[PDB]
Amino acid sequence: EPINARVIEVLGRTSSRGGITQVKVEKRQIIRNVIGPVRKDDILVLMESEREARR
Amino acid sequence: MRAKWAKKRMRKLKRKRRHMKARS
Amino acid sequence: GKVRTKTIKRAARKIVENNYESLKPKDFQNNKAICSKRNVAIIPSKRLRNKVAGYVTTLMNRVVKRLQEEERERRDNYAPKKSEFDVSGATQQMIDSIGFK
Amino acid sequence: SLEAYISIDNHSFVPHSAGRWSAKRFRKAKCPVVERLTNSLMMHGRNSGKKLMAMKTVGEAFELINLYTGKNPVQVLVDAVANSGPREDSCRRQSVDVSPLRRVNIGIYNIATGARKAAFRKVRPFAECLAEEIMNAAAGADKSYAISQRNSVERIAVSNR
Amino acid sequence: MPVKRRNNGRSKYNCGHTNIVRCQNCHRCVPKDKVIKRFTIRNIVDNTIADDVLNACVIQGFAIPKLYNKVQYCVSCSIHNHIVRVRSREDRKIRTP
RNA sequence: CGAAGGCCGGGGGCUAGAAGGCGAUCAGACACCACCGUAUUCCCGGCCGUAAACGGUGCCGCCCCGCGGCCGGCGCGCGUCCCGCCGGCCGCCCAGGGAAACCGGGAGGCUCCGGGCUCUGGGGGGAGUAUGGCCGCAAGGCUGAAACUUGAAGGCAUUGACGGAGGGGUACACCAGACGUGGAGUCUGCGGCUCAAUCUGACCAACGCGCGCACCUCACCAGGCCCGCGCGGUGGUGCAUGGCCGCUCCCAGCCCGUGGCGCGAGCCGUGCUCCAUUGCGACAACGAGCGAGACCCCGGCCGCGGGCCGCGGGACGGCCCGCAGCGGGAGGACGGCGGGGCGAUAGCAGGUCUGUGAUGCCCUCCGCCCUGGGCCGCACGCGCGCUACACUGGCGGGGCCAGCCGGCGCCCGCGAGGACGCGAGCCCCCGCCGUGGCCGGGACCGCGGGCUGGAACGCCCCCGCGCACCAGGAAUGUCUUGUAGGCGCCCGCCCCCACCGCG
Ligand SMILES: [K+]
Ligand SMILES: [K+]
Ligand SMILES: [K+]
Ligand SMILES: [K+]
Ligand SMILES: [K+]
Ligand SMILES: [K+]
Ligand SMILES: [K+]
Ligand SMILES: [K+]
Ligand SMILES: [K+]
Ligand SMILES: [K+]
Ligand SMILES: [K+]
Ligand SMILES: [K+]
Ligand SMILES: [K+]
Ligand SMILES: [K+]
Ligand SMILES: [K+]
Ligand SMILES: [K+]
Ligand SMILES: [K+]
Ligand SMILES: [K+]
Ligand SMILES: [K+]
Ligand SMILES: [K+]
Ligand SMILES: [K+]
Ligand SMILES: [K+]
Ligand SMILES: [K+]
Ligand SMILES: [K+]
Ligand SMILES: [K+]
Ligand SMILES: [K+]
Ligand SMILES: [K+]
Ligand SMILES: [K+]
Ligand SMILES: [K+]
Ligand SMILES: [K+]
Ligand SMILES: [K+]
Ligand SMILES: [K+]
Ligand SMILES: [K+]
Ligand SMILES: [K+]
Ligand SMILES: [K+]
Ligand SMILES: [K+]
Ligand SMILES: [K+]
Ligand SMILES: [K+]
Ligand SMILES: [K+]
Ligand SMILES: [K+]
Ligand SMILES: [K+]
Ligand SMILES: [K+]
Ligand SMILES: [K+]
Ligand SMILES: [K+]
Ligand SMILES: [K+]
Ligand SMILES: [K+]
Ligand SMILES: [K+]
Ligand SMILES: [K+]
Ligand SMILES: [K+]
Ligand SMILES: [K+]
Ligand SMILES: [K+]
Ligand SMILES: [K+]
Ligand SMILES: [K+]
Ligand SMILES: [K+]
Ligand SMILES: [K+]
Ligand SMILES: [K+]
Ligand SMILES: [K+]
Ligand SMILES: [K+]
Ligand SMILES: [K+]
Ligand SMILES: [K+]
Ligand SMILES: [K+]
Ligand SMILES: [K+]
Ligand SMILES: [K+]
Ligand SMILES: [K+]
Ligand SMILES: [K+]
Ligand SMILES: [K+]
Ligand SMILES: [K+]
Ligand SMILES: [Mg+2]
Ligand SMILES: [Mg+2]
Ligand SMILES: [Mg+2]
Ligand SMILES: [Mg+2]
Ligand SMILES: [Mg+2]
Ligand SMILES: [Mg+2]
Ligand SMILES: [Mg+2]
Ligand SMILES: [Mg+2]
Ligand SMILES: [Mg+2]
Ligand SMILES: [Mg+2]
Ligand SMILES: [Mg+2]
Ligand SMILES: [Mg+2]
Ligand SMILES: [Mg+2]
Ligand SMILES: [Mg+2]
């Protein structure tokens, strides 16, 4: 049972080599890391809402 | 050598000399 | 990623200071204005001229937001009709210890 | 694989367009999808370029799907593109989730790759390999190469949460 | 090796000997007036859940308790973990926090 | 009297823990890290007498610009404060001092040298050793030489280089990928081996590099003319030199006049941004210059002129929003123009004397020429490449399109090529083969027919013969738009001849 979240904004490049990006998605403010090229108002498939990104 | 261990070495040497001179 | 060198800027400042009346803040008129040899300007190339005019047009729309040196002087000399000087515990002790009080 | 990254209405009478689709970051999101598949198809190395031939290759794989499923080929293509593409990846490897444009990219890539590997050194033609690949990805069948690749990626993502 | 600091690297004024403390990272012995000292006040629950604990609390007027910890580290551990930095010769005289 | 460790005799015994044991790591680990643990750590009575026992600064006394903080006692003032005094502990600091770092409550009042007292030193080693003495249960401690050896050791400070140091930037260096190379055969260069000679240079920045070796080239071998049939000299030395090139480095860096600081080596000048020491703004510095940029060549779009070439216009972070400049939109041929040329100060015992009538000093009279041979010889290891391993393919017939600029007509000949005269491949379409080292792949070899040239050993064509190779270990390279890759075409060296380089 995967859920649909929606990127609310982009926070920055996380890893030591660029790669993933920290994003705020959405009634929540969950913060997560993404590998691909994300714009604003992109819909992501979340396998769980339990884990939150560090920092 | 670090001077502390040189001092340790010299003390062992002097004690060996005293022991050898103890005989006779 | 287009930073103007000091050569553009130093010429653009003398051009704006000398020819304030001629330069509108719109670019084609200034492109012509960085061309005349009567407002004497020896620009030895047209790309150079365009870059200088691009900085001149920008200098124009920054002074709106010489005419601002005549008024600054003409406001440093105004004496109003007042004089701006028309309780104490220790200075009282000092006016008694000086004069009448 | 979202509606905002699979372009339906921009197609032409053949996929050839001469478009500068990769001059900006997100421009290819408006690239037609059959042309994206065509661009992925000519990716063996001895076949670089040779787009005129790949357009035929895809063109004769749409008269096989219409004769097996009996439905619109472009629709089954959209279904295959949507079904494939990992939703979760692993990058001290911790789990992350995948963006839409990358899901579409990896999907189209793995369909092309599955056909490519299944046709080498075989009597079976590469076009009728593409038919198998497309009709089997869109369903969800484990025989699809893109679905097995997706499942592997998602398993490694789960083991690294 | 000339003298680097007027305080000789410690705060010892008009006494012969002072107490021993253990570094909280590596557990070496340090004199008390040399050890790097910081005081921290924080909440027992992280701020990222500080409102969900609160909304799921039965007691009316509850207030999240805090933690009071005095951390003390040696010179090596302080430099390694960036509690203090190596400074320029002019900057070393600055005592501002 | 005297930290800790240590010793003698009693007591006690939680923790940690020399020694010892054990698990890892590692080439080894008897160490660092993990675990278990004896003396010890604690009490009592003694012994020992040492520590970076430090402020590396002996004790008593006098004078000494100032601004603050804290501790103890006391006094005056207002209405806790406030101003003093004595004693203590600290910070900053004018003068003065000093080799400087720095001191400044002295390390001041000192070559303008003298208040009193005690201790210690006299280049570096040998050596705090030998010997004797005193003390100690012991471990030690205190006192303490000489022969001999050596040209420096050492202090404080400057610039650079480096750091498994911190901080800030950055590039196809990595990320996401593509295409490979390394495995097969084969072209070419290198090392070794052989040889009468297989001429020689170079080991990121040597190894398709020193512009195509039958003769010539030619420096090398076997012979032979001249002055079989001084003058020269590609001799040496690029570690004796010029010039040109490469590299540090296409990095953003370098540096002058006047003032200022220091005894001096030296220093100053020399945060926010940009591709950038590009700029804003600040400053004991003020003012200039070089490198950067500007500049030159090419190519996209539009006008006037000529008959496509040759003269100009055009783009500027200019417009509109959001916060010197970073973002997002728009129009336009092109959006922050794009690909090249040039290329600072300072240097490296890279390269080159074998490109010259550049050239010093050494040595040869090894000059010039002719015939033949070698540079290409081959158990073997390496670098750059070429062609493949097939069906996204091979073959047969047809169709049709370039740019760097550029001859082809008519007969013979399967072809290759000859005698005689004058001004593109990929791809597309239609078939064939059918997963079989097969019709994939074309090395090796056997007859022939030609071209070049004084001369094949050079190259081309025809029939036949049909190697290895099934996508390649450990490793390893290049690349972001008309780009990678695929496909061919042309020029250079050139009698002939590209698997090469420039395009
Ligand atoms: K010592
Ligand atoms: K010592
Ligand atoms: K010792
Ligand atoms: K020293
Ligand atoms: K010292
Ligand atoms: K200290
Ligand atoms: K104290
Ligand atoms: K104390
Ligand atoms: K502290
Ligand atoms: K330490
Ligand atoms: K004692
Ligand atoms: K003791
Ligand atoms: K003991
Ligand atoms: K015990
Ligand atoms: K005890
Ligand atoms: K011990
Ligand atoms: K041990
Ligand atoms: K050891
Ligand atoms: K060790
Ligand atoms: K233990
Ligand atoms: K013991
Ligand atoms: K004990
Ligand atoms: K102890
Ligand atoms: K104890
Ligand atoms: K003792
Ligand atoms: K000492
Ligand atoms: K000390
Ligand atoms: K004394
Ligand atoms: K007080
Ligand atoms: K007081
Ligand atoms: K006191
Ligand atoms: K007091
Ligand atoms: K007091
Ligand atoms: K007081
Ligand atoms: K006093
Ligand atoms: K005092
Ligand atoms: K005082
Ligand atoms: K004092
Ligand atoms: K004394
Ligand atoms: K003394
Ligand atoms: K002494
Ligand atoms: K002494
Ligand atoms: K003796
Ligand atoms: K004794
Ligand atoms: K005894
Ligand atoms: K004993
Ligand atoms: K004894
Ligand atoms: K003894
Ligand atoms: K003795
Ligand atoms: K020294
Ligand atoms: K010394
Ligand atoms: K020394
Ligand atoms: K010393
Ligand atoms: K100095
Ligand atoms: K010095
Ligand atoms: K080369
Ligand atoms: K001055
Ligand atoms: K001077
Ligand atoms: K200065
Ligand atoms: K300065
Ligand atoms: K300077
Ligand atoms: K400076
Ligand atoms: K400055
Ligand atoms: K003309
Ligand atoms: K002309
Ligand atoms: K302009
Ligand atoms: K030369
Ligand atoms: Mg005693
Ligand atoms: Mg224990
Ligand atoms: Mg234990
Ligand atoms: Mg002593
Ligand atoms: Mg001492
Ligand atoms: Mg002492
Ligand atoms: Mg105090
Ligand atoms: Mg104090
Ligand atoms: Mg003080
Ligand atoms: Mg003396
Ligand atoms: Mg003795
Ligand atoms: Mg004795
Ligand atoms: Mg000095
Ligand atoms: Mg020859």
Secondary structure of D89-111 as H, E, C letters? EECCCCEEECCHHHHHHHHHHHH
Residue A4 corresponds to which tokens in the numbers above? 């649909």
Cα dist from E31 to E8, E11, E91, whole Å:
13, 10, 25
Phi-psi region of A33 (alpha: psi -120 to 50; beta: other; left: phi over 0): beta
D 90-119: CB within 7 Å of strand F: 112, 115-116, 119
Cα dist from D134 to C45, D2, D33, D110, whole Å:
61, 18, 14, 11
D chain contacts of residue A15, beta-carbon cutoff 8 Å: 91
Residue D74 CB contacts under 8 Å (≥ 6 apart), including other chains:
D8, D11, D34, D62
Residues D52 and D15: their CA atoms lie apart, in Å, by: 10
Burial class (CB in 10 A: 0-12, 13-18, 19+), D38: buried
Q: Which of residues 67-106 of D touch A (CB under 8 A)?
A: 87-89, 91, 94-103
Domain residue limits, chain A: 1-55
Alpha helices in chain C (DSSP H): 6-18, 27-33, 46-63, 67-73, 92-96
Chain A nearest-CA distance from D89, in A, is 8
Range of the domain at E7: 1-97
- Give the residue on D whose Cα is nearest the Cα of A52: D96
Q: How many domains does chain E have?
A: 1
A chain contacts of residue D99, beta-carbon cutoff 8 Å: 34-38, 42, 44
Residues E20 and E34: their CA atoms lie apart, in Å, by: 10
Give the strand pairing for A31-34 and E20-22: unpaired
Residue D36 CB contacts under 8 Å (≥ 6 apart), including other chains:
D28, D104, D108
Chain A nearest-CA distance from D22, in A, is 14
Cα dist from D81 to C35, D37, D61, D104, whole Å:
60, 10, 16, 6
Residue C16 CB contacts under 8 Å (≥ 6 apart), including other chains:
C23, C56, C59, C60, C63
Q: Tell me chain A's radius of gyration from C-alpha atoms.
A: 11
Q: Is the CB of residue A51 less than 8 Å away from at least one CB of chain D? A: yes
Residues D104 and D115: their CA atoms lie apart, in Å, by: 17
CB D133 within 8 A of CB D114: yes
Chains in contact with C, where contact means 3 or more Cβ–Cβ distances below 8 Å, are none
Q: Which residues of C62-84 are buried (b: 16+ CB within 10 A; e: fewer)?
A: eeeeeeeeeeeeeeeeeeeeeee
Asked whether residue C27's C-beta has any atom of DNA/RNA strand F within 7 A, the reply is: yes
**Three-class secondary structure of residue C54 per DSSP:** helix
Longest alpha-carbon distance in chain E: 65
Cα dist from E79 to D44, D115, E29, whole Å:
55, 58, 17
Residue E3 CB contacts under 8 Å (≥ 6 apart), including other chains:
none
Solved using: cryo-EM
Give the number of residues written for chain A. Answer: 55
CB D99 within 8 A of CB D45: no
**Three-class secondary structure of residue C34 per DSSP:** coil
- Beta carbons within 10 angstroms of residue E94's beta carbon: 9
Q: Tell me chain B's radius of gyration from C-alpha atoms.
A: 11
Burial class (CB in 10 A: 0-12, 13-18, 19+), B12: exposed
Pick the closest to residue D97 from A10, C43, A20 (CA basis). Answer: A20
Backbone φ and ψ for A12, nearest 5 degrees, come out as: 150, 175
Beta strands in D54-97 (DSSP E): 88-90, 95-97
Angle between the N-to-C axes of helices D100-119 and D33-41, in degrees from 0 to 180, rounded to the nearest 10: 40
Suggest the residue from A23, A32, A45 to mutate for an interface test with chain D (most D CBs closer than 10 A). Answer: A45
**Dihedral, CA of residue D158, residue D26, residue D15 and residue D80, to nearest 10:** 20
Pick the closest to residue C51 from C11, C99, C17 (CA basis). Answer: C11
Q: Which amino acid is at D78?
A: V
CB C52 within 8 A of CB C12: yes
Residues C29 and C9: their CA atoms lie apart, in Å, by: 19
Residues D100 and A40: their CA atoms lie apart, in Å, by: 12
Q: Which amino acid is at D6?
A: I
Phi-psi region of E4 (alpha: psi -120 to 50; beta: other; left: phi over 0): alpha
Q: Tell me chain C's radius of gyration from C-alpha atoms.
A: 27
Residues C23 and C31: their CA atoms lie apart, in Å, by: 10
Residues D130 and D117: their CA atoms lie apart, in Å, by: 11
Residues D35 and D41: their CA atoms lie apart, in Å, by: 10
Angle between the N-to-C axes of helices D51-59 and D33-41, in degrees from 0 to 180, rounded to the nearest 10: 120
Pick the closest to residue A3 from A26, A29, A37 (CA basis). Answer: A26
DSSP character for A36?
A: S
Asked whether residue C61's C-beta has any atom of DNA/RNA strand F within 7 A, the reply is: yes
D 26-45: CB within 7 Å of strand F: 41-45
Residues B7 and B1: their CA atoms lie apart, in Å, by: 10
